């Protein structure tokens, strides 16, 4: 808790004084002398020890405006239609959202702006802010800042006014002391100074700042967000405001930085503010709406809107009473600041007696009555003067120059990777494992000819392990950018400081990532093991992966997910991937293909690396094409090696001309790659640094009695609920309530068996006398606090579907959508029963989705209760009093309500009809009618002997102070033991006593139905279920969209860079690459699609779970079905974009077998497309959060794609490997495809796949190669030299059964690839079951 400057705040920051000018070195400032006062000390301290530079840095700001106007001006099938007409409203009226107003704030002031939502508070406070960023201001205005200008404010003086509304944004990772810290070091100016270090002057300033909020305590706490914990939820904001006075803010303003918050955490925040105000001159501007009597008593000056008209402006304590004097009433026991809301509200408000036909009714009466005031007059006088007297009387707003804000930028980065090393280390080590794995696979390539396809195999992989190594750093840059944005909005630093800062940061990832794969790759492979050339290799390396860094920090600054960056960039990727130059042979590149690798970061890359490899070598020639039984005793000179550099009666075989033949590289080549690998990097980051500075922006009654309830903490049993018994009557309403520590929702939440620990010792609820059944638990409604829904799912949709697997199956549809109707008309819905749930922002209001959370609790027809959980909790004071309406509505038809109730107003708490307080240890204090006007309660609270409630006050926080729960209040008797001892309890007891006596021979109603666990059969939940999910995806902004174009893009790429190809000796091996880099977009369809399984998995668990709508197998079977559809879609489209460009189709014109390979190669990309949503699902049943998934899922990915059988086959992997390469799923899909689309056809070799044979003297080739045609494949082509060109595959099948692919075995493939998809099924269930179901 905050009491503001207390006499403790005065010693902590004495002992901070005395502390610090131990190390620096009038009667005050003097921290060892009597009589020191620390408020005089903060404020001196400031403009002492900061000396005075030779800018106009004011130390306190004031904003006066005399004529201040300002004016302004779904389902996927239709979205395109709608982007074109968006379009043509980028192709090619005028009303006063804020009318004219006069006001003048100065410093030391606190001043509030009140109005109910939509009057115009936020746009008033964004104006006074200089914000004005979506609407425009009058020219006739002036607004003065101290004698300044809103340009001159927002040109090169920003930082002194700040604007932050409602969202803290800190780095949750980054403790107090450390975030304030860092602000207080980047505002000290270096400019001399004193004789102290820069370094102790900011922890001065830190410790100083902590300790006037009350922040001491909570050093070295990390800050958090509402997932990471740490400081809870009001030292947060306490942190916000103390980093805004860090900064030298001078006009903060903020927009219900107090929305969703209890009195108290308000209260204590408008404290914050007000010692804000006091101690450092500041002149802060707050828009609340709930604000407690208490809070309002701090406010120096207030100005309330109607419709942004501005009715009255001035000081708060004279506000009623001028508003009194207009001749409207006040009724007792209600707030000021509820009073002033209220009287803009036409329904609420009413005129004094006597005055019904003299108050005005319009905005333009309140401002006429307004202007004629003499108030009015005084202030455009006081305006008038202060616009005289400002009128009679720094390069940048940055306070350290570039270089000091990139090393403290840097610093930060090291310290949030100290508080979370989760991505630096899993990055290093997968790195390492990766590199340890693909090695084993390489591992030692021999030194003939036959290692020639796998060495460049290798250079290729390596390649890529560098390029995508620093992929996951992009996360990083979606953290911090809400921060950074906030913090150029300070002037602290700017965006490209902390782009810098981000690079350098990383530098020593980068490096252990480098050493670790590298190190490790290239001598367990056996590459070249000369020095200069590993260590070439390493630069090379290091260049690719900066290069590949900065572009994908180039695509990642202008994207906030990482899916959303992944999808439009996946065509990129693979563009470059296939492009690299091992994929496709620049001879076998295509004209339209080349213009892209010319452009190609890594095309130069992998050339310098085989260049460099290669170059200046000799290899032992492996096989010779003519050999076998037949020539067992032929010449050297006859023979040749089978290499595409081979020369005849050579027995080795050149690297230069391989490499000159095959690939088209050559050596000088090998320098200036790395020369043009450096430009691209640097124009990569140029592009990157430019992107973050420019381009951003009933007939049972319910009774327990004696009901106790502990729970076992840390081996200690502490009694929770002591002896607890009441009731809930048809037609009445209850409200529990109680202290923070009284445990109220403990009581709600074992009353409704919602509550999964503690044990019930001494409990008795019954329901009409008798003891619980099996059926209770479906005949209570349970209204959430938190409103989970669907935001794809429209009012009546939602309604509709609880209303169909929650009511009886004996009933038909039409009466289920009658109740539905019914519903919908009860609460005064039907404006809006077909509009989408949607998200907070747009959509549906705070009010809507409480109403439609009640309205889903309803159609089920609990006949028994309706227990609420805080209704009017984080609620504006209107809309909390319009669902007391409707409570109270409810009740008045005949239905039995519990409800929590924390921290009420006077008003609503007068609604109710009964009340049970608890105090600390859940022991009960008063049970019983309210009375009018909370009295009877009061009576009892009086005549047992306590202090006479006051006749202006609200009694609910009287209670609290009574019962001494209330902060700084004394019991002065413990409640409990003359609870026990009065006759209200005896007159309860007996009460208890007859129901239970009476109530028990009633004629109870028996049916079966209403004993079962669910009231909707297995089969009608999981159609339902998968439905909904289908109708989700669809309905989804962009989701199928970004699949269609993801997938047709990567396919049509894929297939068209492979346009017709030639079935060479090199051609095969293309096609299978290609078949092989088909399979790249499962990791971007996996990121794509498991936020859409996270959205339902939270709906289902956190309401739909333990309401008992549908088992955990209806959702986990509706979640598996809904994707398969899609996916089937999806995989059709891009079979046609894939198969038909590649021209595979011609390969099965010779055997007249067209039909059977298509339809079944169509079959297997349908199967891998489903395959991959059924492993992404697999991979996300267990684990919590979308990322860890998706990481799982590419690492399977991987190593499934390692062991496939086209890097090395099993005659070359290791035996401890045999066993991936057996198991693996994507090693029968490969051999289908392959054999599908390559099998039974011709090959015909390239012009430089020719080899030279010269027969022996006096032989012909016929004669001389015909046996070795015969003992294997192959064909020969005379040549007018008397040698001739021998090709060594005269058809596909012996390339595939050198790729261990069989024409025989593609049915046998896709059935056991069926099988692998049905256990990825299998094992989603049982592992959803294990891990998440309870
Ligand atoms: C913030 C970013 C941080 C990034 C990190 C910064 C890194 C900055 C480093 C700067 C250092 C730059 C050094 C470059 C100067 C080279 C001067 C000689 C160039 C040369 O000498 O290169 C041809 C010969 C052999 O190449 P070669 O196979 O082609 O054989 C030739 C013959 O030797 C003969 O000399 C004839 O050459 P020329 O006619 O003159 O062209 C021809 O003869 P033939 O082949 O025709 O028979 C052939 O080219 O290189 C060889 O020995 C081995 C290959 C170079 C060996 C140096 C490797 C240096 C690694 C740098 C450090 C890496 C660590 C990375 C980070 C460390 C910690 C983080
Ligand atoms: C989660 C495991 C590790 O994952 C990354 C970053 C570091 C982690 C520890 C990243 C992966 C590649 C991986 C290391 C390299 C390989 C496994 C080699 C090769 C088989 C993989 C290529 C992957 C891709 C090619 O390019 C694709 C793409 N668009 O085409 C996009 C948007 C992302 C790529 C990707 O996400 O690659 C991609 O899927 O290192």
Known sequence: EYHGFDAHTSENIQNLARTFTHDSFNDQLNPDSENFNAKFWVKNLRKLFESDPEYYKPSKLGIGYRNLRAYGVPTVTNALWKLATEGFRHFQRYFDILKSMDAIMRPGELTVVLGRPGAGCSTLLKTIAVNTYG?????????????????????????????????????????????????????????????????????????????????????????????????????????????????????????????????????????????????????????????????????????????????????????????????????????????????????????????????????????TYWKNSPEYAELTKEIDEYFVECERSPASPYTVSFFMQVRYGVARNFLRMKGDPSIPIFSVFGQLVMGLILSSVFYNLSQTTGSFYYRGAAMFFAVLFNAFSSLLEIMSLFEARPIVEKHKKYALYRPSADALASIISELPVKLAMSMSFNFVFYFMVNFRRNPGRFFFYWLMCIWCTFVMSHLFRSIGAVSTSISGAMTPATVLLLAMVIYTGFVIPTPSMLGWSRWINYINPVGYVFESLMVNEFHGREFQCAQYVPSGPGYENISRSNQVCTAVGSVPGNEMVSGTNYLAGAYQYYNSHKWRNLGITIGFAVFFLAIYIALTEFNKGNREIFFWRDLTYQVK?????????????????????????????????????????????????????????????????????????????????????????????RQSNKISKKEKDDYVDYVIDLLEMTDYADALVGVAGEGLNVEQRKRLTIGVELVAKPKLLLFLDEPTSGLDSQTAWSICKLMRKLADHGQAILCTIHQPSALIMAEFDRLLFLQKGGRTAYFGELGENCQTMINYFEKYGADPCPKEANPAEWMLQVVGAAPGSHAKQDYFEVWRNSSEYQAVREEINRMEAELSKLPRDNDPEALLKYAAPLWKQYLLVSWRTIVQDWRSPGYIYSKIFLVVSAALFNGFSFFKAKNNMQGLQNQMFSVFMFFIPFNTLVQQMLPYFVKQRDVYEVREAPSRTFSWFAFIAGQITSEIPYQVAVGTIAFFCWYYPLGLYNNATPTDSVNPRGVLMWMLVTAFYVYTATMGQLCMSFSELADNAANLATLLFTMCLNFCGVLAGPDVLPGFWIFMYRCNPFTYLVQAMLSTGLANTFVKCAEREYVSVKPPNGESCSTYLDPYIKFAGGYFETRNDGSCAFCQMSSTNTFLKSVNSLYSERWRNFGIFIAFIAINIILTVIFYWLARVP
Not at 269 to 297: E, G, H, M, W
Not at 354 to 362: A, C, I, N, S, W
Request: with cysteine.
């Open 713 to 805: 903490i840390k081996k200690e049993d502490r009694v929770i609920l002591d002896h607890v018994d009441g009731w809930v009557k048809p037609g009445q309403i209850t409200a529990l309530m109680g202290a923070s520590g009284a445990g109220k929702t403990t009581l709600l939440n074992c009353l409704s068996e919602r509550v999964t620990t503690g044990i019930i010792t001494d409990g008795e609820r019954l329901v009409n006398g008798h003891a619980l059944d099996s059926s209770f638990q479906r005949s209570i409604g349970y209204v959430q606090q938190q409103d989970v829904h669907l935001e794809t799912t429209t009012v009546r949709e939602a309604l509709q579907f609880s209303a169909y697997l």
């Open 135 to 367: 609407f425009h201001i009058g020219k006739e205005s002036q607004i003065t800042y101290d004698g300044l200008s809103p340009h001159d404010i927002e040109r090169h003086y920003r930082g002194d006014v700040i604007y932050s509304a409602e969202t803290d944004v800190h780095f949750p990772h980054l403790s107090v002391g450390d975030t304030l810290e860092f602000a207080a070091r980047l505002r000290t100016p270096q400019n001399r100074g004193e004789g102290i270090d820069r370094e102790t002057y900011a922890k001065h300033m830190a410790s100083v700042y902590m300790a006037t909020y009350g922040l001491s305590h909570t050093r070295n706490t990390n800050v958090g967000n509402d997932f990471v914990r740490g400081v809870s939820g009001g030292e947060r904001k306490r942190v916000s405001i103390a980093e805004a006075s860090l900064s030298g803010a001078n006009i903060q303003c903020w927009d219900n930085a107090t929305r969703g918050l209890d009195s108290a955490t308000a209260l204590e925040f408008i404290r914050a503010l007000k010692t804000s105000a006091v101690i450092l001159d500041t002149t802060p501007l707050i828009a609340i709406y709930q604000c407690s009597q208490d809070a309002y008593d701090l406010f120096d000056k207030v100005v309330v809107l109607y419709e942004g008209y501005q009715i009255f402006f001035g000081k708060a304590t004279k506000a009623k009473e001028y508003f009194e004097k207009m001749g409207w009433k006040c009724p007792q026991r209600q707030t000021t600041a509820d009073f002033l809301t209220s009287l803009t509200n036409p329904a609420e408000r009413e005129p004094l007696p006597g005055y019904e036909d003299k108050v005005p009714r319009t905005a333009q009466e309140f401002e």
